[PDB]
Protein backbone atom coordinates (compact mmCIF):
# COMPACT_ATOMS: atom_id res chain seq x y z
CA UNK A 1 0.00 0.00 0.00
CA UNK A 2 2.69 2.48 1.00
CA UNK A 3 4.58 1.85 -2.24
CA UNK A 4 2.05 4.02 -4.03
CA UNK A 5 1.93 6.57 -1.22
CA UNK A 6 5.68 7.11 -1.58
CA UNK A 7 5.46 7.62 -5.34
CA UNK A 8 2.73 10.21 -4.90
CA UNK A 9 4.98 12.30 -2.69
CA UNK A 10 7.96 11.91 -5.00
CA UNK A 11 6.16 13.08 -8.14
CA UNK A 12 4.37 15.65 -6.01
CA UNK A 13 7.69 17.36 -5.33
CA UNK A 14 8.49 17.15 -9.03
CA UNK A 15 5.16 18.84 -9.67
CA UNK A 16 6.13 22.08 -7.90
CA UNK A 17 9.52 22.08 -9.62
CA UNK A 18 7.68 22.14 -12.94
CA UNK A 19 5.42 24.95 -11.76
CA UNK A 20 8.24 26.88 -10.09
CA UNK A 21 10.18 27.20 -13.34
CA UNK A 22 7.65 27.87 -16.05
CA UNK A 23 4.84 29.47 -14.04
CA UNK A 24 7.04 31.57 -11.80
CA UNK A 25 6.22 35.12 -10.82
CA UNK A 26 8.04 37.03 -13.60
CA UNK A 27 10.57 39.48 -12.17
CA UNK A 28 9.68 42.87 -13.57
CA UNK A 29 12.47 45.41 -13.48
CA UNK A 30 12.49 48.91 -11.86
CA UNK B 1 0.47 37.36 -26.00
CA UNK B 2 -2.50 39.69 -25.56
CA UNK B 3 -4.23 39.82 -22.16
CA UNK B 4 -7.49 37.87 -22.18
CA UNK B 5 -10.55 40.16 -21.91
CA UNK B 6 -12.60 37.34 -20.33
CA UNK B 7 -11.04 37.65 -16.87
CA UNK B 8 -13.82 37.43 -14.29
CA UNK B 9 -13.71 37.30 -10.50
CA UNK B 10 -15.32 34.80 -8.13
CA UNK B 11 -16.75 35.66 -4.73
CA UNK B 12 -18.39 33.84 -1.84
CA UNK B 13 -19.99 35.98 0.85
CA UNK B 14 -20.27 34.93 4.48
CA UNK B 15 -23.90 33.85 4.31
CA UNK B 16 -22.81 31.47 1.55
CA UNK B 17 -19.86 30.19 3.57
CA UNK B 18 -22.32 29.11 6.22
CA UNK B 19 -24.49 27.23 3.76
CA UNK B 20 -21.39 25.55 2.43
CA UNK B 21 -19.86 24.39 5.70
CA UNK B 22 -23.21 23.34 7.10
CA UNK B 23 -23.92 21.36 3.94
CA UNK B 24 -20.68 19.41 4.16
CA UNK B 25 -20.78 18.56 7.87
CA UNK B 26 -24.43 17.45 7.85
CA UNK B 27 -24.12 14.88 5.12
CA UNK B 28 -20.79 13.90 6.63
CA UNK B 29 -22.85 13.17 9.75
CA UNK B 30 -25.18 11.23 7.44
CA UNK B 31 -22.86 9.07 5.38
CA UNK B 32 -20.07 8.41 7.90
CA UNK B 33 -22.41 6.03 9.69
CA UNK B 34 -22.37 3.91 6.53
CA UNK B 35 -18.68 4.12 5.61
CA UNK B 36 -17.61 2.46 8.84
CA UNK B 37 -20.56 -0.01 8.54
Amino acid sequence: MEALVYTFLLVGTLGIIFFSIFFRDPPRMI
Amino acid sequence: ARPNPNKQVVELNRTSLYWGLLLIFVLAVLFSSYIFN
Binding site: E2, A3, T7, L10, F22, P27, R28, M29, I30 | -
Partner: protein
Protein backbone atom coordinates in the same frame (compact mmCIF):
# COMPACT_ATOMS: atom_id res chain seq x y z
CA UNK C 1 15.79 35.06 -46.03
CA UNK C 2 18.92 33.92 -47.84
CA UNK C 3 19.98 32.01 -44.71
CA UNK C 4 20.59 28.29 -44.92
CA UNK C 5 18.75 25.54 -43.09
CA UNK C 6 21.83 25.19 -40.89
CA UNK C 7 22.18 28.87 -40.06
CA UNK C 8 18.50 28.96 -39.09
CA UNK C 9 19.35 26.10 -36.70
CA UNK C 10 22.46 27.68 -35.18
CA UNK C 11 20.61 30.94 -34.55
CA UNK C 12 18.21 28.95 -32.38
CA UNK C 13 20.58 26.86 -30.26
CA UNK C 14 22.75 29.87 -29.45
CA UNK C 15 19.67 32.08 -29.14
CA UNK C 16 19.67 33.70 -25.70
CA UNK C 17 15.93 34.30 -25.71
CA UNK C 18 14.77 30.77 -24.97
CA UNK C 19 13.28 30.11 -21.56
CA UNK C 20 16.09 27.67 -20.82
CA UNK C 21 19.28 28.23 -22.77
CA UNK C 22 20.45 25.21 -24.73
CA UNK C 23 23.82 25.98 -26.28
CA UNK C 24 26.09 23.38 -27.78
CA UNK C 25 26.79 21.59 -24.53
CA UNK C 26 23.06 21.43 -23.98
CA UNK C 27 22.42 19.56 -27.20
CA UNK C 28 24.22 16.60 -25.64
CA UNK C 29 23.54 17.39 -22.00
CA UNK C 30 19.76 17.40 -22.34
CA UNK C 31 19.43 14.00 -24.09
CA UNK C 32 21.85 12.47 -21.59
CA UNK C 33 20.22 13.76 -18.42
CA UNK C 34 16.70 12.94 -19.60
CA UNK C 35 18.02 9.48 -20.36
CA UNK C 36 19.60 9.15 -16.92
CA UNK C 37 16.66 10.73 -15.09
CA UNK C 38 14.00 8.55 -16.68
CA UNK C 39 15.91 5.34 -16.03
CA UNK C 40 16.73 6.34 -12.44
CA UNK C 41 13.04 6.68 -11.62
CA UNK C 42 12.16 3.26 -12.99
CA UNK C 43 14.96 1.36 -11.27
CA UNK C 44 14.17 3.18 -8.04
CA UNK C 45 10.61 1.84 -8.27
CA UNK C 46 10.58 -1.43 -10.22
CA UNK C 47 14.03 -2.90 -10.35
CA UNK C 48 14.25 -6.61 -9.60
CA UNK C 49 16.84 -7.44 -6.94
CA UNK C 50 20.46 -7.30 -8.03
CA UNK C 51 23.33 -9.64 -7.27
CA UNK C 52 25.78 -6.99 -6.13
CA UNK C 53 28.66 -9.23 -5.01
CA UNK C 54 28.50 -12.11 -7.47
CA UNK C 55 27.64 -14.65 -4.77
CA UNK C 56 24.06 -14.88 -6.16
CA UNK C 57 22.27 -13.33 -3.19
CA UNK C 58 20.20 -10.54 -4.77
CA UNK C 59 19.84 -7.27 -2.88
CA UNK C 60 16.50 -5.49 -3.02
CA UNK C 61 16.35 -1.84 -3.99
CA UNK C 62 12.84 -1.05 -5.21
CA UNK C 63 9.89 0.64 -3.54
CA UNK C 64 7.67 -2.08 -4.94
CA UNK C 65 9.74 -4.73 -3.14
CA UNK C 66 9.09 -3.60 0.40
CA UNK C 67 11.43 -0.64 0.73
CA UNK C 68 10.82 2.91 1.76
CA UNK C 69 12.48 6.11 0.55
CA UNK C 70 15.47 5.70 2.81
CA UNK C 71 16.19 2.06 2.08
CA UNK C 72 15.59 2.47 -1.64
CA UNK C 73 18.66 2.35 -3.85
CA UNK C 74 19.85 1.64 -7.35
CA UNK C 75 22.14 -1.30 -6.68
CA UNK C 76 25.65 -1.23 -8.23
CA UNK C 77 26.86 -3.55 -10.96
CA UNK C 78 27.87 -7.07 -9.91
CA UNK C 79 31.37 -8.06 -8.86
CA UNK C 80 31.66 -10.64 -11.63
CA UNK C 81 31.31 -7.98 -14.32
CA UNK C 82 34.00 -5.75 -12.89
CA UNK C 83 35.03 -3.04 -15.33
CA UNK C 84 33.69 -4.68 -18.50
CA UNK C 85 31.46 -2.33 -20.48
CA UNK C 86 28.07 -3.96 -19.97
CA UNK C 87 25.43 -2.17 -22.05
CA UNK C 88 21.90 -3.37 -22.60
CA UNK C 89 22.61 -5.31 -25.80
CA UNK C 90 25.44 -7.50 -24.52
CA UNK C 91 22.96 -9.22 -22.22
CA UNK C 92 21.03 -12.01 -23.89
CA UNK C 93 17.67 -11.35 -22.27
CA UNK C 94 16.58 -8.09 -20.70
CA UNK C 95 16.09 -9.76 -17.33
CA UNK C 96 19.67 -11.04 -17.43
CA UNK C 97 20.68 -7.39 -17.69
CA UNK C 98 18.61 -6.42 -14.64
CA UNK C 99 19.83 -9.25 -12.40
CA UNK C 100 23.50 -8.53 -13.12
CA UNK C 101 23.45 -4.86 -12.16
CA UNK C 102 22.20 -3.30 -15.34
CA UNK C 103 20.85 0.20 -14.73
CA UNK C 104 23.69 1.28 -12.44
CA UNK C 105 26.20 1.47 -15.25
CA UNK C 106 23.66 2.98 -17.64
CA UNK C 107 22.91 5.85 -15.25
CA UNK C 108 26.47 6.69 -14.17
CA UNK C 109 27.81 6.85 -17.72
CA UNK C 110 25.02 9.19 -18.79
CA UNK C 111 25.10 11.11 -15.50
CA UNK C 112 28.83 11.85 -15.50
CA UNK C 113 28.72 12.83 -19.15
CA UNK C 114 25.79 15.08 -18.32
CA UNK C 115 27.46 16.94 -15.47
CA UNK C 116 30.68 17.46 -17.39
CA UNK C 117 28.52 19.31 -19.89
CA UNK C 118 26.35 21.16 -17.41
CA UNK C 119 29.68 22.71 -16.47
CA UNK C 120 30.11 23.44 -20.16
CA UNK C 121 26.95 25.44 -20.66
CA UNK C 122 27.65 27.41 -17.50
CA UNK C 123 30.62 28.73 -19.40
CA UNK C 124 28.73 29.07 -22.67
CA UNK C 125 25.90 31.28 -21.45
CA UNK C 126 28.43 33.42 -19.61
CA UNK C 127 30.12 34.06 -22.94
CA UNK C 128 26.74 34.86 -24.49
CA UNK C 129 26.01 37.64 -21.98
CA UNK C 130 29.38 39.30 -21.62
CA UNK C 131 29.92 37.91 -18.13
CA UNK C 132 33.32 36.89 -16.87
CA UNK C 133 33.60 33.13 -17.27
CA UNK C 134 34.66 31.60 -13.97
CA UNK C 135 31.40 30.20 -12.64
CA UNK C 136 32.19 27.05 -14.63
CA UNK C 137 35.36 26.69 -12.57
CA UNK C 138 33.43 26.76 -9.31
CA UNK C 139 31.06 24.03 -10.47
CA UNK C 140 34.07 21.79 -11.04
CA UNK C 141 34.43 21.28 -7.31
CA UNK C 142 31.34 19.03 -7.01
CA UNK C 143 32.09 17.58 -10.45
CA UNK C 144 35.49 16.53 -9.14
CA UNK C 145 33.74 15.02 -6.14
CA UNK C 146 31.09 13.16 -8.10
CA UNK C 147 33.58 11.83 -10.64
CA UNK C 148 35.52 10.24 -7.80
CA UNK C 149 32.73 8.36 -6.04
CA UNK C 150 31.39 6.94 -9.31
CA UNK C 151 34.30 6.50 -11.67
CA UNK C 152 37.71 7.13 -10.17
CA UNK C 153 37.14 4.90 -7.19
CA UNK C 154 35.87 1.83 -9.13
CA UNK C 155 38.96 2.03 -11.33
CA UNK C 156 41.45 1.69 -8.49
CA UNK C 157 39.43 -1.10 -6.93
CA UNK C 158 38.68 -2.72 -10.26
CA UNK C 159 34.92 -3.06 -10.03
CA UNK C 160 31.79 -0.95 -10.10
CA UNK C 161 30.42 -2.80 -7.08
CA UNK C 162 32.67 -0.82 -4.73
CA UNK C 163 31.30 2.49 -6.22
CA UNK C 164 28.62 4.38 -4.39
CA UNK C 165 24.99 3.25 -4.78
CA UNK C 166 22.28 5.69 -5.74
CA UNK C 167 20.45 5.46 -2.43
CA UNK C 168 20.25 7.17 0.92
CA UNK C 169 20.91 4.04 2.93
CA UNK C 170 23.06 2.96 0.00
CA UNK C 171 25.33 5.94 0.59
CA UNK C 172 25.61 5.19 4.30
CA UNK C 173 26.98 1.73 3.64
CA UNK C 174 29.53 3.22 1.26
CA UNK C 175 30.72 5.63 3.93
CA UNK C 176 31.19 2.81 6.43
CA UNK C 177 32.95 0.29 4.18
CA UNK C 178 35.29 3.00 2.92
CA UNK C 179 36.58 4.06 6.32
CA UNK C 180 36.93 0.43 7.37
CA UNK C 181 39.35 -0.14 4.39
CA UNK C 182 40.95 3.20 4.07
CA UNK C 183 40.50 5.21 7.33
CA UNK C 184 39.28 8.41 5.69
CA UNK C 185 39.01 10.38 8.94
CA UNK C 186 42.79 10.12 9.42
CA UNK C 187 43.60 11.54 5.98
CA UNK C 188 44.44 15.27 5.69
CA UNK C 189 42.44 15.65 2.51
CA UNK C 190 39.27 14.67 4.33
CA UNK C 191 40.40 17.08 7.03
CA UNK C 192 40.58 19.88 4.49
CA UNK C 193 37.17 19.09 3.05
CA UNK C 194 35.62 18.96 6.51
CA UNK C 195 37.10 22.41 7.08
CA UNK C 196 35.86 23.27 3.61
CA UNK C 197 32.22 23.02 4.68
CA UNK C 198 32.47 24.01 8.33
CA UNK C 199 34.33 27.06 7.12
CA UNK C 200 31.95 27.34 4.19
CA UNK C 201 28.86 27.40 6.38
CA UNK C 202 30.46 29.85 8.81
CA UNK C 203 31.37 32.20 5.98
CA UNK C 204 27.76 32.12 4.79
CA UNK C 205 26.15 32.57 8.19
CA UNK C 206 28.50 35.43 9.03
CA UNK C 207 28.36 37.23 5.69
CA UNK C 208 24.62 36.85 5.39
CA UNK C 209 24.04 38.16 8.89
CA UNK C 210 25.93 41.41 8.43
CA UNK C 211 24.24 42.32 5.18
CA UNK C 212 20.85 41.82 6.82
CA UNK C 213 21.99 43.81 9.85
CA UNK C 214 22.95 46.88 7.82
CA UNK C 215 19.85 47.40 5.70
CA UNK C 216 18.75 50.97 5.14
CA UNK C 217 15.38 52.06 6.53
CA UNK C 218 12.99 52.34 3.58
CA UNK C 219 9.80 50.52 4.59
CA UNK C 220 7.36 50.49 7.50
CA UNK C 221 7.40 47.90 10.27
CA UNK C 222 4.30 45.99 9.21
CA UNK C 223 5.80 45.55 5.75
CA UNK C 224 8.70 43.14 5.37
CA UNK C 225 12.27 44.34 5.11
CA UNK C 226 12.61 42.73 1.68
CA UNK C 227 10.35 45.41 0.19
CA UNK C 228 13.01 48.11 0.46
CA UNK C 229 14.98 46.57 -2.38
CA UNK C 230 13.41 47.05 -5.80
CA UNK C 231 14.76 45.01 -8.65
CA UNK C 232 17.40 46.46 -10.94
CA UNK C 233 18.19 49.48 -8.82
CA UNK C 234 21.51 51.29 -8.93
CA UNK C 235 22.05 52.62 -5.40
CA UNK C 236 23.37 50.34 -2.69
CA UNK C 237 20.88 48.64 -0.38
CA UNK C 238 23.09 48.31 2.72
CA UNK C 239 25.80 50.32 4.45
CA UNK C 240 29.15 48.63 3.82
CA UNK C 241 31.36 50.88 5.96
CA UNK C 242 29.10 50.14 8.94
CA UNK C 243 29.57 46.38 8.61
CA UNK C 244 33.35 46.61 8.32
CA UNK C 245 33.18 49.05 11.22
CA UNK C 246 31.15 46.56 13.24
CA UNK C 247 33.28 43.53 12.39
CA UNK C 248 36.43 45.57 12.93
CA UNK C 249 35.40 46.20 16.53
CA UNK C 250 34.48 42.55 16.95
CA UNK C 251 37.87 40.86 16.70
CA UNK C 252 40.30 43.54 15.47
CA UNK C 253 40.48 45.95 12.55
CA UNK C 254 43.05 44.00 10.51
CA UNK C 255 40.82 40.88 10.60
CA UNK C 256 38.22 42.31 8.21
CA UNK C 257 37.75 42.96 4.52
CA UNK C 258 36.90 46.54 3.64
CA UNK C 259 37.15 45.78 -0.09
CA UNK C 260 33.89 43.99 -0.89
CA UNK C 261 35.36 42.64 -4.11
CA UNK C 262 38.09 41.00 -2.08
CA UNK C 263 35.42 39.69 0.28
CA UNK C 264 33.30 37.83 -2.26
CA UNK C 265 36.39 36.25 -3.76
CA UNK C 266 37.26 34.79 -0.36
CA UNK C 267 33.78 33.33 -0.03
CA UNK C 268 34.20 31.64 -3.38
CA UNK C 269 37.77 30.49 -2.90
CA UNK C 270 37.46 28.93 0.55
CA UNK C 271 35.02 26.02 -0.04
CA UNK C 272 36.00 25.42 -3.66
CA UNK C 273 39.64 24.86 -2.79
CA UNK C 274 38.47 22.81 0.19
CA UNK C 275 36.30 20.47 -1.86
CA UNK C 276 39.14 20.00 -4.35
CA UNK C 277 41.29 18.29 -1.75
CA UNK C 278 38.52 16.04 -0.48
CA UNK C 279 37.78 15.19 -4.10
CA UNK C 280 41.42 14.31 -4.61
CA UNK C 281 41.37 12.56 -1.24
CA UNK C 282 39.42 9.49 -2.22
CA UNK C 283 40.89 9.78 -5.68
CA UNK C 284 44.25 8.98 -4.12
CA UNK C 285 42.55 6.56 -1.75
CA UNK C 286 41.19 4.80 -4.83
CA UNK C 287 44.75 3.79 -5.66
CA UNK C 288 45.27 2.41 -2.14
CA UNK C 289 47.10 5.19 -0.31
CA UNK C 290 44.86 5.09 2.71
CA UNK C 291 45.74 7.61 5.39
CA UNK C 292 47.49 7.75 8.66
CA UNK C 293 48.00 4.62 10.75
CA UNK C 294 49.24 5.02 14.32
CA UNK C 295 48.43 1.53 15.57
CA UNK C 296 50.82 0.24 18.26
CA UNK C 297 52.75 3.51 18.00
CA UNK C 298 53.11 4.69 21.60
CA UNK C 299 55.40 2.09 23.20
CA UNK C 300 57.39 2.54 26.40
CA UNK C 301 60.42 0.63 27.65
CA UNK C 302 60.13 -3.13 28.30
CA UNK C 303 58.19 -3.38 25.01
CA UNK C 304 54.61 -2.64 26.03
CA UNK C 305 52.05 -0.95 23.83
CA UNK C 306 50.00 1.85 25.33
CA UNK C 307 46.59 2.58 23.86
CA UNK C 308 45.82 5.92 22.31
CA UNK C 309 42.62 7.08 20.71
CA UNK C 310 44.09 5.80 17.44
CA UNK C 311 43.98 2.30 18.85
CA UNK C 312 40.32 2.84 19.72
CA UNK C 313 39.53 3.87 16.14
CA UNK C 314 41.41 0.71 15.13
CA UNK C 315 38.86 -1.37 17.03
CA UNK C 316 36.02 0.33 15.19
CA UNK C 317 37.73 -0.29 11.85
CA UNK C 318 38.64 -3.84 12.79
CA UNK C 319 35.02 -4.50 13.70
CA UNK C 320 33.85 -3.33 10.29
CA UNK C 321 36.64 -4.93 8.26
CA UNK C 322 35.48 -8.39 9.28
CA UNK C 323 31.82 -7.67 8.58
CA UNK C 324 31.56 -6.04 5.14
CA UNK C 325 30.77 -8.54 2.36
CA UNK C 326 30.04 -11.10 4.73
CA UNK C 327 30.02 -14.16 2.43
CA UNK C 328 32.72 -13.09 -0.03
CA UNK C 329 36.16 -13.42 1.52
CA UNK C 330 37.67 -16.90 1.28
CA UNK C 331 41.12 -15.61 2.21
CA UNK C 332 42.59 -13.67 5.17
CA UNK C 333 43.30 -10.45 3.22
CA UNK C 334 40.97 -7.94 1.61
CA UNK C 335 42.99 -7.26 -1.53
CA UNK C 336 39.86 -6.60 -3.58
Amino acid sequence: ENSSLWARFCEWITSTENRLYIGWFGVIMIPCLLTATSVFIIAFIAAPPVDIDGIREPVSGSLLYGNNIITGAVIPTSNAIGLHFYPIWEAASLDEWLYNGGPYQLIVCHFLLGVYCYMGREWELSFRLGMRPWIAVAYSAPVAAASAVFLVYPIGQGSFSDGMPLGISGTFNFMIVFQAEHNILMHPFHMLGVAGVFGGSLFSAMHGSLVTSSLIRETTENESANEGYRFGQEEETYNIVAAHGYFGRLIFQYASFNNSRSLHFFLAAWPVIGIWFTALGLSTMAFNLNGFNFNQSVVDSQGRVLNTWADIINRANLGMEVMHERNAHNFPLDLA
